[PDB]
Design a protein around this ligand. Structure first.
Ligand SMILES: Nc1nc2c(ncn2[C@@H]2O[C@H](COP(=O)(O)OP(=O)(O)OP(=O)(O)O)[C@@H](O)[C@H]2O)c(=O)[nH]1
Ligand SMILES: Cc1cc2nc3c(=O)[nH]c(=O)nc-3n(C[C@H](O)[C@H](O)[C@H](O)COP(=O)(O)O)c2cc1C
Ligand SMILES: [Cl-]
Ligand SMILES: [Cl-]
Ligand SMILES: [Cl-]
Ligand SMILES: [Mg+2]
Length: 317
């Protein structure tokens, strides 16, 4: 089937398993319409589109449809980032997995200047339902990758680095967030969705909301934090396998640039520690039955593309 990026229509896909049903994919057309960036949109509920003139009764119809896991089509006023009003002929429908249970919601927007009626409304409704069907077929091939590991090991940074080629400043702990990549693999594009999760132990009861139907896990530890490495065996491997006994795991050693960093080596020496070496990482990967061991740096990007390329190959090949 076609891939998601070839659908030149306004739409988003949300994950209703996560708290508050956040957007996990947004089309380029949607970004253009709404004036928001992908990093501003993913991981958030789509209600940010609403504003002063939006009919709240219409919004409640959408809420009701989602709660009942049924499709609905409505028209309501929405707003771009800069505050420009538009009418949104909006269609929502659940996407079910092979077992028939709801996995995602698909939402399609047809923007205009007016509330359309009669013939024009009928035509609009027919168009967006067709679009939703096309997205459903394409979304069946979205690869779900979930990234787990101790707090501050660099999970978020490697996702931001891979998707924007930037490096983030201030450390801000994650709850959940999502990223999207379109990756060429053997000459064909693949849609990869990346679920970022919290390393904090106090998020243990929430974290597994991200786990169902995962295609591949990245378990991450920092090459310069032995505690994070030991937690791979004691915490992360057991947790992942408890929920997903059969899903491939890639073990990822992060912060590769710090392993040969003089200040870092000295600080570890003060702690009576040394960085984790490649053979040590590889041995841990073998111990936990990981399909690959990979090392990378979000900062320099060394090894970074290979992490996601191998994640996809673990699923497709
Ligand atoms: N030198 C270096 N520092 C990094 C690298 N990746 C992450 N960092 C640093 O590590 C800190 C933690 O990075 P995050 O990506 O936010 O950590 P996380 O694993 O997402 O943490 P949680 O969201 O709390 O689970 C960052 O603020 C950076 O200072 C890297 O590749 N090299
Ligand atoms: C797939 C998906 C797409 C959505 N797209 C829009 C949108 O285009 N515009 C909008 O106003 N609300 C959209 N929503 C609806 C809001 O996310 C939310 O369900 C609605 O505001 C009602 O819930 P609330 O009362 O908790 O806000 C979308 C919801 C989902 C599931
Ligand atoms: Cl919602
Ligand atoms: Cl570290
Ligand atoms: Cl490096
Ligand atoms: Mg994070």
């Amino acid at each position: 089937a076609t891939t998601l990026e070839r659908i030149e229509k306004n739409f988003v896909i949300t994950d209703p398993r996560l708290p508050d049903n956040p957007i996990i994919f947004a089309s380029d057309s949607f970004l253009q319409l709404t004036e928001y960036s992908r990093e501003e949109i993913l991981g958030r509920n789509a209600r940010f589109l609403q504003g002063p003139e939006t009919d709240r009764a219409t919004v409640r119809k959408i809420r009701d449809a989602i709660d009942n896991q049924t499709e609905v089509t409505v028209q309501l006023i929405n707003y771009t980032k800069s505050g420009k009003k538009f009418w949104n002929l909006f269609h929502l429908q659940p996407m079910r997995d092979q077992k028939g249970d709801v996995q995602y919601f698909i939402g399609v927007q047809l923007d205009g200047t007016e509330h359309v009626r009669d013939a024009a409304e009928r035509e609009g409704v027919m168009l967006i339902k067709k679009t939703a069907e096309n997205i459903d077929e394409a979304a069946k091939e979205l690869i779900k990758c979930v990234v787990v590991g101790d707090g501050a090991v660099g999970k978020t940074c490697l996702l931001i680095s891979y998707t924007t080629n930037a490096f983030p400043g201030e450390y801000i702990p994650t709850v959940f967030d999502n990223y999207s990549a379109n990756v060429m693999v053997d000459g064909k594009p693949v849609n990869l969705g990346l679920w970022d999760t919290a390393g904090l132990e106090d998020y243990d009861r929430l974290r597994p909301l991200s786990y169902p139907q995962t295609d591949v896990f990245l378990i991450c530890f920092s090459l310069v934090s032995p505690a994070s490495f030991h937690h791979v065996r004691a915490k992360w491997y057991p947790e992942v396998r408890h929920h997903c006994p059969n899903t491939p795991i890639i073990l990822v050693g992060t912060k590769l640039d710090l392993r040969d960093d003089k200040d870092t080596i000295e600080k570890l020496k003060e702690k009576k520690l040394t960085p984790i070496t490649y053979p040590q990482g590889l041995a841990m990967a073998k111990e936990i039955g990981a399909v690959k061991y990979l090392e990378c740096s979000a900062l320099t990007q060394r090894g970074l593309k290979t992490v996601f390329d191998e994640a996809i190959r673990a699923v497709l090949c």
